[model samples]
Target: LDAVRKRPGMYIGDTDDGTGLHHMVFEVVDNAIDEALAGHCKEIIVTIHADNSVSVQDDGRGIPTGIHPEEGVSAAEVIMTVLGVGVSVVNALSQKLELVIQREGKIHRQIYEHGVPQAPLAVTGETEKTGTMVRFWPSLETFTNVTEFEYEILAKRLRELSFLNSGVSIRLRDKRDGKEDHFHYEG
Candidate 1:
């Protein structure tokens, strides 16, 4: 954040705009992809809504649900809190957003904001499937220049993700302004 606060323009190409906000979304998604490489996930879905809210879902085994030996908290919480640390000088100027993981077969939803836990990871109810879902809305206060995302940009991103992951399947959907576009890839 220091770099971004100091030379914000250098990192995001602009400081007085929403490009930084867009950078945050990509950073979080890249971390999700890393989780997939760790054998914890299979597929990832990213949705950009008309309201400027973004959601990322993964059909992986979900973040480890066990308790952290050192922190004495749920591993899920540890994961969310530390996800930001994963970004070092290599990408410190970027905002590493947190995700709320909703296990497919459970009712509990883990909530995170800016890589910190606003609520403990706890079970909400019961379900039949298993995975993780993260939904978030970028703060309008942070980026006042841009309101909505471009569909073509998101489509091209999804296509690139599909190509990079090879066997992994990715889907991108835009439900904005009453217009919907679905892009899916299965390998």
Candidate 2:
């Protein structure tokens, strides 16, 4: 946490411009794309909240929440805290982040503030659905030049990804302005 928050640019991208700020969204989205690439995911929704927080949700097998055999913590926590660079970096750069995983007929959730877990991962509810949702607010201290994400920037890449990975439906919604776009390509 200290290392990433201290020198976020090295982990994400240039912070002064809007690249890193927008890159944060892609970092999360790319994970969903990976699931699509592997034939596990079909739909991904990216929502830009009015407060500028972003949520990326994917209809795939949710990240494993079972306790890690060796790590002794939930596998989802391991990915957010240690295993995945993109997820960990997102957790570090954000002021607050909430991770929800729905799988195995249960909904598991965890909260993190500035990369520190507020509490251990817990089963919050029951669900027959399966997916993962991560919502986070970027840190103002880190993105000094610009904190707002340009909808066009997000739409462009998402459009490209849709064409690149056929059959996957990617949707972008901006709550701030009610702008929305859906991208899906069969070819």
Each model's Cα RMSD: 4.4, 1.2
Query: Tens-digit lDDT track for model 2 on 1-187?
Result: 5888888898999998899998999999988988899998999999999987999999999998899999998888888877325788998989999999999999999999888889999999999899999999999989987778899999999998888999999999999989999998997
Q: What is the lDDT of residue 186 in candidate 1?
A: 50
lDDT scores of the candidates, listed in order? 0.59, 0.91
lDDT (C-alpha) at residue 180 in model 2: 98
Q: For candidate 2, which ten residues in a row score worst on lDDT?
A: 77-86
Candidate 2 Cα errors over 4 Å, as ranges: 83-85
Question: What value does the lDDT take at residue 9 in candidate 2?
Answer: 90
- Regions of candidate 1 where Cα sits further than 4 Å from its true position: 1-15, 38-40, 83-105, 113-116, 178-187
lDDT of 1 by residue, 59-130 (tens): 776667768999999876665554232322113332333344456566556654443456677777776766
> lDDT (0-100) at residue 104 of candidate 2?
92
